[PDB]
């Protein structure tokens, strides 16, 4: 089209894009059961002993 | 040249433990004093 005609400045962008449905409700990972830092758990064990 | 180069709520680490741990250690020193007092009372 640009070879036989003369276009202008593109006032809107386009292209071959991809549409993907968003994953509703991200699940907490397996390691989500540890809010305490690793040093936290170790210190608790040592105090218990 | 642009895309190829590639490289959560906070977790309690030592703010909660510091207060709690100081409590446990504080009790242990008091416990050592209590036992000495308790043994002294039982001595008589």
PDB file of C-alpha atoms in Angstrom:
ATOM      1  CA  UNK A   1       0.000   0.000   0.000  1.00  0.00           C
ATOM      2  CA  UNK A   2       2.834   2.409   0.817  1.00  0.00           C
ATOM      3  CA  UNK A   3       4.478   1.600  -2.532  1.00  0.00           C
ATOM      4  CA  UNK A   4       1.642   2.809  -4.777  1.00  0.00           C
ATOM      5  CA  UNK A   5       0.074   5.341  -2.375  1.00  0.00           C
ATOM      6  CA  UNK A   6       1.590   7.897   0.018  1.00  0.00           C
ATOM      7  CA  UNK A   7       0.523   7.418   3.632  1.00  0.00           C
ATOM      8  CA  UNK A   8       0.892   9.840   6.550  1.00  0.00           C
ATOM      9  CA  UNK A   9       2.055   9.805  10.175  1.00  0.00           C
ATOM     10  CA  UNK A  10       0.373   6.843  11.944  1.00  0.00           C
ATOM     11  CA  UNK A  11      -2.173   8.370  14.314  1.00  0.00           C
ATOM     12  CA  UNK A  12      -3.168   4.963  15.754  1.00  0.00           C
ATOM     13  CA  UNK A  13      -1.044   1.896  16.466  1.00  0.00           C
ATOM     14  CA  UNK A  14      -1.884  -1.633  15.349  1.00  0.00           C
ATOM     15  CA  UNK A  15      -0.345  -5.035  14.777  1.00  0.00           C
ATOM     16  CA  UNK A  16      -0.800  -8.770  15.170  1.00  0.00           C
ATOM     17  CA  UNK A  17      -1.407  -8.930  18.928  1.00  0.00           C
ATOM     18  CA  UNK A  18      -2.576 -11.783  21.157  1.00  0.00           C
ATOM     19  CA  UNK A  19      -5.623 -11.758  23.442  1.00  0.00           C
ATOM     20  CA  UNK A  20      -5.586 -14.093  26.456  1.00  0.00           C
ATOM     21  CA  UNK A  21      -8.256 -14.435  29.130  1.00  0.00           C
ATOM     22  CA  UNK A  22      -6.960 -13.426  32.548  1.00  0.00           C
ATOM     23  CA  UNK A  23      -6.589 -16.205  35.126  1.00  0.00           C
ATOM     24  CA  UNK A  24      -9.155 -15.248  37.757  1.00  0.00           C
ATOM     25  CA  UNK A  25      -8.306 -16.024  41.367  1.00  0.00           C
ATOM     26  CA  UNK A  26      -4.569 -16.624  41.606  1.00  0.00           C
ATOM     27  CA  UNK A  27      -4.000 -19.491  44.035  1.00  0.00           C
ATOM     28  CA  UNK A  28      -1.580 -19.184  46.925  1.00  0.00           C
ATOM     29  CA  UNK A  29       1.577 -21.223  46.217  1.00  0.00           C
ATOM     30  CA  UNK A  30       2.625 -24.349  48.103  1.00  0.00           C
ATOM     31  CA  UNK A  31       5.068 -22.357  50.258  1.00  0.00           C
ATOM     32  CA  UNK A  32       2.345 -19.853  51.219  1.00  0.00           C
ATOM     33  CA  UNK A  33       1.962 -21.518  54.641  1.00  0.00           C
ATOM     34  CA  UNK A  34       5.168 -19.880  55.973  1.00  0.00           C
ATOM     35  CA  UNK A  35       4.795 -16.171  56.795  1.00  0.00           C
ATOM     36  CA  UNK A  36       7.724 -16.453  59.183  1.00  0.00           C
ATOM     37  CA  UNK A  37      11.239 -16.060  57.839  1.00  0.00           C
ATOM     38  CA  UNK A  38      13.489 -19.147  57.929  1.00  0.00           C
ATOM     39  CA  UNK A  39      15.479 -17.550  60.752  1.00  0.00           C
ATOM     40  CA  UNK A  40      12.136 -17.167  62.532  1.00  0.00           C
ATOM     41  CA  UNK A  41      11.418 -20.905  62.506  1.00  0.00           C
ATOM     42  CA  UNK A  42      14.965 -21.860  63.519  1.00  0.00           C
ATOM     43  CA  UNK A  43      14.960 -19.431  66.449  1.00  0.00           C
ATOM     44  CA  UNK A  44      11.625 -20.794  67.684  1.00  0.00           C
ATOM     45  CA  UNK A  45      12.964 -24.359  67.626  1.00  0.00           C
ATOM     46  CA  UNK A  46      16.141 -23.416  69.503  1.00  0.00           C
ATOM     47  CA  UNK A  47      14.153 -21.537  72.150  1.00  0.00           C
ATOM     48  CA  UNK A  48      11.868 -24.548  72.620  1.00  0.00           C
ATOM     49  CA  UNK A  49      14.850 -26.836  73.230  1.00  0.00           C
TER      50      UNK A  49
ATOM     51  CA  UNK B   1      18.705  -6.419  22.143  1.00  0.00           C
ATOM     52  CA  UNK B   2      15.667  -5.412  24.254  1.00  0.00           C
ATOM     53  CA  UNK B   3      13.687  -8.469  25.371  1.00  0.00           C
ATOM     54  CA  UNK B   4      16.408 -11.132  25.630  1.00  0.00           C
ATOM     55  CA  UNK B   5      18.110  -9.515  28.643  1.00  0.00           C
ATOM     56  CA  UNK B   6      16.008 -10.511  31.660  1.00  0.00           C
ATOM     57  CA  UNK B   7      16.745 -10.737  35.377  1.00  0.00           C
ATOM     58  CA  UNK B   8       4.185  -9.999  48.028  1.00  0.00           C
ATOM     59  CA  UNK B   9       3.184  -8.976  51.554  1.00  0.00           C
ATOM     60  CA  UNK B  10       5.987  -8.586  54.062  1.00  0.00           C
ATOM     61  CA  UNK B  11       6.944 -11.498  56.312  1.00  0.00           C
ATOM     62  CA  UNK B  12       7.619 -11.045  60.022  1.00  0.00           C
ATOM     63  CA  UNK B  13      11.351 -11.709  60.377  1.00  0.00           C
ATOM     64  CA  UNK B  14      12.768 -10.278  63.618  1.00  0.00           C
ATOM     65  CA  UNK B  15      10.273  -7.636  64.768  1.00  0.00           C
ATOM     66  CA  UNK B  16       7.714  -9.972  66.346  1.00  0.00           C
ATOM     67  CA  UNK B  17      10.332 -12.430  67.616  1.00  0.00           C
ATOM     68  CA  UNK B  18      12.498  -9.801  69.319  1.00  0.00           C
ATOM     69  CA  UNK B  19       9.733  -8.782  71.713  1.00  0.00           C
ATOM     70  CA  UNK B  20       8.550 -12.347  72.294  1.00  0.00           C
ATOM     71  CA  UNK B  21      12.071 -13.763  72.616  1.00  0.00           C
ATOM     72  CA  UNK B  22      13.061 -11.083  75.126  1.00  0.00           C
ATOM     73  CA  UNK B  23      10.002 -12.167  77.116  1.00  0.00           C
ATOM     74  CA  UNK B  24      11.074 -15.823  77.152  1.00  0.00           C
ATOM     75  CA  UNK B  25      14.641 -14.938  78.136  1.00  0.00           C
ATOM     76  CA  UNK B  26      13.355 -12.490  80.740  1.00  0.00           C
ATOM     77  CA  UNK B  27      11.215 -15.211  82.280  1.00  0.00           C
ATOM     78  CA  UNK B  28      14.118 -17.662  82.368  1.00  0.00           C
ATOM     79  CA  UNK B  29      16.246 -15.293  84.462  1.00  0.00           C
ATOM     80  CA  UNK B  30      13.271 -14.674  86.758  1.00  0.00           C
ATOM     81  CA  UNK B  31      12.683 -18.423  86.947  1.00  0.00           C
ATOM     82  CA  UNK B  32      16.280 -18.961  88.037  1.00  0.00           C
ATOM     83  CA  UNK B  33      15.752 -16.342  90.752  1.00  0.00           C
ATOM     84  CA  UNK B  34      12.433 -17.907  91.784  1.00  0.00           C
ATOM     85  CA  UNK B  35      13.932 -21.390  92.155  1.00  0.00           C
ATOM     86  CA  UNK B  36      16.753 -20.031  94.318  1.00  0.00           C
ATOM     87  CA  UNK B  37      14.177 -18.193  96.433  1.00  0.00           C
ATOM     88  CA  UNK B  38      11.949 -21.282  96.500  1.00  0.00           C
ATOM     89  CA  UNK B  39      14.829 -23.549  97.528  1.00  0.00           C
ATOM     90  CA  UNK B  40      15.891 -21.053 100.204  1.00  0.00           C
ATOM     91  CA  UNK B  41      12.357 -21.016 101.620  1.00  0.00           C
ATOM     92  CA  UNK B  42      12.280 -24.825 101.583  1.00  0.00           C
ATOM     93  CA  UNK B  43      15.670 -24.886 103.333  1.00  0.00           C
ATOM     94  CA  UNK B  44      14.150 -23.543 106.562  1.00  0.00           C
TER      95      UNK B  44
END
